[PDB]
Design a protein around this ligand. Sequence first.
Ligand code: NA
Ligand code: NA
Ligand code: NA
Lengths: 244, 251
Amino acid sequence: ATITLERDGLQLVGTREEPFGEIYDMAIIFHGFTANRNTSLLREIANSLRDENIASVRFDFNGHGDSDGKFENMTVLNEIEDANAILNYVKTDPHVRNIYLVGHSQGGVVASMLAGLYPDLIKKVVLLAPAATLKGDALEGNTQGVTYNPDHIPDRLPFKDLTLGGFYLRIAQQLPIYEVSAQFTKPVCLIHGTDDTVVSPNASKKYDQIYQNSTLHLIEGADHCFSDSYQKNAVNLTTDFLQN
Amino acid sequence: NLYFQGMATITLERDGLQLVGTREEPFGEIYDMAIIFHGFTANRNTSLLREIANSLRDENIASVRFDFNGHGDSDGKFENMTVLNEIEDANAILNYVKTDPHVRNIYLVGHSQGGVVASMLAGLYPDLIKKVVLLAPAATLKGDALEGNTQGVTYNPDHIPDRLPFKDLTLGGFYLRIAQQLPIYEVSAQFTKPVCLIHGTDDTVVSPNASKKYDQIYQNSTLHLIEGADHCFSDSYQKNAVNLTTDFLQN
Ligand code: NA
Ligand code: NA
Ligand code: NA
């Protein structure tokens, strides 16, 4: 049902997907930049794993969806602290046996980098279109088509309908994404479609070259938010990988 | 402001928590500002932090010092404190400091762990920060975490626990994993602007080579190897550190 946690005086609200039994494995589903806990792609990954004896938890990040916090004061950094607060709960739960991390878009950087700091704890990582391009993007003064000077990052910038802060782009510019991630040497699943416009498939190609044990799945024709017909495939690879 | 000058108690907000602080104002309605960071298990009002705050005001330079999360009057469990979220604490102070009418230039100052917080925020904010003063900066903490002995307390650095008992409190295991992979030198090195480094020869807490590696890595460094001095600039040495911090920020 709807479960609740805390990270430095901010409430983190999530949907736990629970299977039948006393002992089960559990996955932590992280969403991307401007996304929320319960979207089509994540909701179906959440559902699918439950049918195969795996539990799951999806939470809104600080400044996203139902959780507390301003979007203005959100960073990939404070999002990893959110990711750690969820892991504190998950690793302290009596029913939870083996932990997995599944991350789409920016949540793909949040999950890989959280797995970099917890390689001894996390048993598997499924990386769907990981937004590791967000560093090289912030460094060239262009994020999702919204510009700035990478040597003059303002206090706040209008983004679509929202307003993100400078500190987000300060951190993004000097994030040791691959560095921290390469610390995770256990199984990794990489899912990236050739038709991705937001995040380049070269982020997943870079990720594969740096991992010890990683499978690269380049699904021909698949977009960024793994839409329509391409969804069931993505969900199938995540499910098949997480049980094996 | 010139009217409300001397000392003040200020309360900031950072992603849910409350960071209680101390503001020292000089005379005139346009002055320079120093952000003062204390180190590991300490607070904003210790003899050294108090004498740097007083001394800079006696040269008409304002100062701000806050307790980090899990320290002093600031909110949060000591268990949930990492180096990373102290930078978040620091950024929040900078969000306050950069949006103040009377603030001419910003200066970053940090002792021990505050020194990492200072070098690491100075590198994320090079266009704003004008000068940086690092007193025995605890960059060693990363190497102390890779080894598995933080301030004498042993632990497996490959199987770091959830929480681990400390001197009087309980240290979070995510702090250990955080500092063990902290890009201290990487981020620090981005600051090309003037850096003043102060380290004690007889320091057993932070190896003086931390300030030497700092000095090495910086484009505009000035190292001061105060002889006989320990980690906490005290007695015949406090007066030496406070002056250098003042004199380098004196124009
Ligand atoms: Na349910
Ligand atoms: Na149990
Ligand atoms: Na970092």
